[PDB]
UniProtKB/Swiss-Prot annotation:
Full-protein residues shown: 132 to 147 of 353
Function recorded in the entry: Required for the differentiation of the dorsal-ventral pattern, and does not appear to be involved in the process of segmentation.
Protein name from the UniProt record: Protein zerknuellt 1
Lineage of the species this protein comes from: Eukaryota, Metazoa, Ecdysozoa, Arthropoda, Hexapoda
Subcellular compartments: Nucleus
Domain of life: Eukaryota
Length: 16
């Protein structure tokens, strides 16, 4: 919900 959103912001946005 967020903790990943803090990482996803660098994992999925890393390949978005």
């Amino acid at each position: 919900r967020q903790i990943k959103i803090f990482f996803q912001n660098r994992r999925m946005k890393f390949k978005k």
